[PDB]
Symmetry: D2
């Protein structure tokens, strides 16, 4: 496939569709690095396998994997899930994957953002990320899709959410941080989102809930369920580490309008009652430069980190008293979809969840 | 997708390997680099594979698979219409470690994943290990969402046989009956594997090939099918040629052979280079114990027979020999309605083979 | 360093000393491969760390480790243990390491045997083993030691034991097996041992206790405690998978004399009462070509697989009722040494134990 | 071995000795990466082999090499040269190697600076450099030597020169560039050099000659031949790419005194008459993020990039008319040493020379 040079998605008539628009397939990277994942990734591999299986009932599923894990990965996953060899540094394809864009006429392209492991050498989560940064192009090659590379602009798919109708929702905590694009003004960043997502309105939330991990990705806080409709985390437990950020996001969203002038309909999503924490007993390597996983570390367990995929919604389950409530709430957001909970506490120990380990590929429409 | 198909054979399941002259959906190639085979860290041969890939792409969608380290360079070198995948490998001979695709009459396609052992394993193979090469067939099948048969404990390479798509396979005794392949099997057991996995009824045995030390005499340097009932065979009257005895004998055998449908084979002569191609001397190639040495004066297996038939084109070796044009003329007469493209591939021949051995076709589904 | 070509240790005046002779250093490879070791090697890395620590009290200790695990390995091990990067396929340096030989005139060389993962493509335990087979040379380079490469002769250090005085002890089950040197007669194999160890008498035991794993390495069955003195595993439990082999080894040893004509003194060593087994809950990858680790598999848990190292002896502990008895018995074999038990059941799940995961380097 | 934490070389009584002080051994990395080195590194491997061979006549020599190249490397090098497997991203051990320091009492330690491929993500020469950055510690482990790690302080051995007597010589162009330690002032950087080298006086030259490559490493411009004596490149060819910087370095050195108050004696060293250039016909991969090697690129061919090693001095030879003159001049700087020229144009295509591909290890004294 080819790089598209000298033009933007917007100029070329391509847009990032909403995650709730029809999907051709879904992508995932197989997890393994022992300085993030306990027990050499054996527990988290089971969780990713379960997520992959859940998605595959709704949408063709694909997993990419290192040279060393290829044979095990192919054995673990059912044959209807396609497996590719692909080098990688960690397994977060929401964030190092391509963001696909489509036009009105049956074509699809990829946006290949610069990836830097959530803050690079300022506050990134490991070093290096050179193989992660090639995942977007390799997936586009597989798909025979041409791509835009955003030179000198760092972004992750998990840091924004689109409605497919001219709006993007994001967080100041993430995009304005020192480790991302520190030379750019907020206005310059807005222009990049407009140009590459094909949007005209940027909705800024303030804080996210994981300042140390992704620097507050919006996908743990709020998302679009449909045009003009958002879900937002909510809690009234003032002891929650998520309390202030959930409260502020909720209040901001109530009065936001999208690009079409619709006042957002905000649907509350609960949070886990109890903190999910790293235990010192977890067998995780310490490596200088890799984010430590220390006893008592509070993990970012948000139910918002779900994947919408065709007729299904794949929702985190953390072993919390609110697991059932979360499924009930998401069901009401998507009354005509099948809601599937998957036990993903093993994913959350590594810094994210179902949404951060997947990347959808939309169906081409038109032509 | 890829499941393995277990407890049955292609023949039992109504699949057959089509002739290489039947319509193709795609062609595959591995990007070359290993410095104990390829001089100058593969730079000269990478240019040659690029030219071969470009030539194929004019006729048939083209695909190259490449190591982690060479991915970025490979993608830069190849035009964008050629798709590039990361794929681990030990060397770049996808005719031999690739899958052999088979089709049925209902529009389906499956892969045959043979056991690969680097042309003789620890008996007389060309390097060690070959564990990544041996996974290429499954990985390409995965990319294609194609289910595959794995031939447990049976070693074979795609370059070691040729099929007419109509019940016949052509092969060499020098290769398939050698100690480093399947020494526990009788000739009859080996015939059965060919019949079951290719869907053939008649195995035509040539004797010697022309590269006993390299592939143990792959048929694809000696003779191939141009169409059902029609073969091409190398030919020389130079008794000083290292190819002479094997060329003369293959030719004589073929003139006495009938295919599975009882047709007397029509044999078309293909010339050989007048001058030997040799390793120099001055080539910068690493020596590693266990890897086939490339020593000054080594005669390289330069056969014009190692061409690829691909849809409306035929891609033919050119060695810088006086017979390069004659070879193109002869191939044109074999395929009067195809476009014949010569590509300078002497840099590939230094590494032990040529255009046919660095490619693997994927047939179109029919029925389908 | 240089390869020594056209001669053998015996011709050049070098011999492999007994393991009970003084040692300069000990070597170990860091374990990790997930199709042998459960939980991506985390539990076994703790056991190897504990073994390395125990050895370091007696003898300078060295661990070699893959690119990916180097940083973790260096963090886990105390600083007195030296850490080198070294590619490898699995972590059994007794078997893919060099066997060092000395001339008792200040010089030392290595024997670099051909390694094939305990049976190659016939019955080996994984494929490939190309990096394992380079370990012996790389360790010799580190030590500035010249080496003899035994072209077309496959051997592992764990398959034989020497007294340093002209005798070697081995098993027919291992050395005569199809996956090792099937082209060679028993007598030709004897001659290779004589040439490369500098011995004159080969003592052949019959069966080992792990036919499927190493093909019956002697180092799980019997060893030399001192010149003229051996220890042999023993059990009276006819339900033991070790029963017949232990019984025959013991009976053979009672009838053997060494190269100096000494009747061997034969001490019995207990065996674990209960079988150690792979559990179904163990999280181990399956890969075609790699020895499967399946529920109920009996693991080769022998107390014989101990390392003699200067003033210490490092002895397996399996969590078995006989763990303390084993330490008692080894103490009586080496009355002037410190006997240290280490919990090594995690190592045994992967097919061997303390002796297999170490390689000594003798003092010059 | 151990990391030394909570103290510096200076506090602990360790100093970096001059390169002209006795050496136990020398280190080198084996080159191969095809997006720097033409022909998959075959020509440059021959050059590194020749450099290693020359050094070995004076001082025991050691080469470290990738998994893939180990067997070829061991075959190419004579057996007296010890070969170790060691992962790396490129082959510039002067710069990613440890800088050894010694005390007066028979001990040696290593300083392990942060390495970032000569400017990191600002203007570094490739990405990533994670394996390069582990070379210093792995070499220290081989040697059983304890090391100081300079957290958050980036430095390369080729960016400074010491006299072993309290002075360090360096360049503003390199140490003060954005891609190195931009949060640190000049004064903060001086303090790090003083603490880690055990020096009291930092002599700042201005420009180096390779702003795009190493950002002007001092070891292409000037070095110490002995306490109180320096060599400095010199040319009167105004068309020379090295003219302005050679002229300015020379003038600054003429005004400089060392940490012991000695007026520096400055010895001129010629520069090549003709520019060494990359040819478009060189077969070198282009990779976004790796310094391109384009037709007509002027290579940094300095005769200053020589290695002093015990009784020998190993001097670049570029195939230039001034090759002999360079040997004559270095001979007069070291009248009692054996001067050995080695053809190293294949090294210079990749951005440096003999000094940048070696790292000495001093003899323990006392």
């Amino acid at each position: 496939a080819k790089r598209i040079v000298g033009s933007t998605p917007k100029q070329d008539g391509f847009r990032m569709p909403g995650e709730f628009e029809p999907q051709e397939k879904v992508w995932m990277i197989w997890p393994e690095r022992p300085d993030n994942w306990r027990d050499g990734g054996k527990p988290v591999q089971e969780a990713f396998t379960n997520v992959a299986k859940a998605i595959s009932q709704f949408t063709p599923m694909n997993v990419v994997v290192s040279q060393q894990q290829f044979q095990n990965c192919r054995r673990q996953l059912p044959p209807e899930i396609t497996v590719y060899e692909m080098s990688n540094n960690d397994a977060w394809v929401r964030d190092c994957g391509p963001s696909f864009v489509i036009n009105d006429h049956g074509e699809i392209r990829g946006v290949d953002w610069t990836f830097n492991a959530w803050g690079g050498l300022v506050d990134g989560l490991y070093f290096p990320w050179d193989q992660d940064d090639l995942v977007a192009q390799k997936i586009c090659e597989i798909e025979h899709v041409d791509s835009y590379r955003t030179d000198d602009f760092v972004l992750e798919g998990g840091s924004f959410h689109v409605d497919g109708q001219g709006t993007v929702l994001t967080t100041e905590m993430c995009l304005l941080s020192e480790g991302r694009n520190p030379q750019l003004s907020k206005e310059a960043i807005e222009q990049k989102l407009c140009d590459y997502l094909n949007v005209e309105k940027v909705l800024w939330l303030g804080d996210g809930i994981d300042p140390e991990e992704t620097n507050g990705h919006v996908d743990d806080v709020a998302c679009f369920i449909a045009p003009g409709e958002v879900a937002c985390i909510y809690t009234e437990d003032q002891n929650s580490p998520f309390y202030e950020a959930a409260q502020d996001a909720y209040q901001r969203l109530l009065k936001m309008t999208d690009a079409k002038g619709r006042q957002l309909k905000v649907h509350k999503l609960c949070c886990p009652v109890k903190n999910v924490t790293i235990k010192g007993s977890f067998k995780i390597d310490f490596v200088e430069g890799t984010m430590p996983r220390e006893d008592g570390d509070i993990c970012i367990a948000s139910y918002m980190n779900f994947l919408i995929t065709n007729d299904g919604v794949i929702v985190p389950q953390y072993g919390d008293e609110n697991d059932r409530l979360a499924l009930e709430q998401v069901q009401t957001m998507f009354p005509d979809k099948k809601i599937v909970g998957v036990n993903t506490v093993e994913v959350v120990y590594g810094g994210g969840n179902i949404h951060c380990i997947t990347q959808q590929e939309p169906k081409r429409v038109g032509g």
